Amino acid sequence: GVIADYNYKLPDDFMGCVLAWNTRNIDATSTGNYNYKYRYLRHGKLRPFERDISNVPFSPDGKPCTPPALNCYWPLNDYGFYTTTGIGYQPYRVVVL
Amino acid sequence: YSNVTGFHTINHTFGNPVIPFKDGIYFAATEKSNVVRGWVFGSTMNNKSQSVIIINNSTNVVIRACNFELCDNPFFAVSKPMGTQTHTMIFDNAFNCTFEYISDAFSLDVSEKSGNFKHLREFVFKNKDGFLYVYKGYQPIDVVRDLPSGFNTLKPIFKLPLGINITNFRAILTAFSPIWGTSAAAYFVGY
Numbered sequence: 001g002v003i004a005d006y007n008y009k010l011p012d013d014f015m016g017c018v019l020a021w022n023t024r025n026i027d028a029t030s031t032g033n034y035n036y037k038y039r040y041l042r043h044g045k046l047r048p049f050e051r052d053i054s055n056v057p058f059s060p061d062g063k064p065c066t067p068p069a070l071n072c073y074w075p076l077n078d079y080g081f082y083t084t085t086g087i088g089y090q091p092y093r094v095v096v097l
Numbered sequence: 098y099s100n101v102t103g104f105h106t107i108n109h110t111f112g113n114p115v116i117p118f119k120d121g122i123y124f125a126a127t128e129k130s131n132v133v134r135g136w137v138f139g140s141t142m143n144n145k146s147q148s149v150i151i152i153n154n155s156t157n158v159v160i161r162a163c164n165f166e167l168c169d170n171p172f173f174a175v176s177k178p179m180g181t182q183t184h185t186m187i188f189d190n191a192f193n194c195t196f197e198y199i200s201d202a203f204s205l206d207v208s209e210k211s212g213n214f215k216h217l218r219e220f221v222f223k224n225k226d227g228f229l230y231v232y233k234g235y236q237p238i239d240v241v242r243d244l245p246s247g248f249n250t251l252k253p254i255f256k257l258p259l260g261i262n263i264t265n266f267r268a269i270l271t272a273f274s275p276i277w278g279t280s281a282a283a284y285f286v287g288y
């Protein structure tokens with residue numbers, strides 16, 4: 001979806017463990033921890049096990065952008081962590097082996 | 098017997114474009130003066146995305162992954178009459194430095210030679226499961242140009258878990274200044 005092909009991709013053969021715990025009182029705030037972002041936007045997708053922190057403005061459909069032009073925006077989208085939400089909008093912290 | 102693009106570095110010809118990595122590459126190095134000494138592997142080739150630089154700075158072998166502010170013409174400058182390297186004009190800035198390697202200390206032949214291309218270095222690069230597979234071969238020859246027909250097994254030297262975005266690359270040459278200039282070398286693309 002958006003995590004693998006845009007933020008960081010994992011291969012489907014060998015993966016270690018997902019160390020995930022509940023940091024509701026650490027990262028979140030009931031108005032919204034709007035201090036963290038994630039990629040939704042790149043000229044294409046990633047290979048397995050690949051970082052991408054490119055703040056070049058891109059296109060959501062892999063289209064080559066010479067900005068300002070068609071579908072040219074910023075690569076990063078908000079999270080919005082509340083302490084007054086369900087688990088789907090609460091932060092966890094994940095360590096991957 | 099597949100198509101090999103030859104980029105010659107001759108007197109006015111200083112060829113180091115952004116070359117696609119698409120699935121991996123075969124770097125050949127027809128050398129006599131150790132002109133080609135490095136590469137920059139990235140995708141955006143600027144300070145926004147992560148990129149790795151793999152160089153020999155004639156003292157060490159340095160592998161470093163950061164957000165390098167890539168110089169659009171990265172080069173090492175060697176004084177042609179002095180025989181010494183003068184410049185390290187690689188990047189202006191580096192930040193979010195992800196990987197860092199420096200090899201053992203040595204002293205490399207910096208000087209310009211003449212005659213035929215003395216040594217061939219054969220390099221094969223792959224981005225597989227987020228590793229950076231870097232494989233190596235080496236044998237001596239003596240020829241003027243035209244990458245010779247031959248057979249040599251290449252060996253794994255570095256299984257580099259970088260985990261970065263590599264779709265494009267650029268070789269890092271050496272400019273010989275006696276104000277820029279070259280001497281004769283050539284490198285080869287090898288998809």
Ligand SMILES: *[C@@H]1O[C@H](CO)[C@@H](O)[C@H](O)[C@H]1NC(C)=O
Nearest residue numbers: 098099100101102103286288
């Ligand atoms: C690739 O090599 C073949 C034979 O060696 C040749 O016919 C062909 O023209 C070469 N490709 C290019 C782009 O020149």
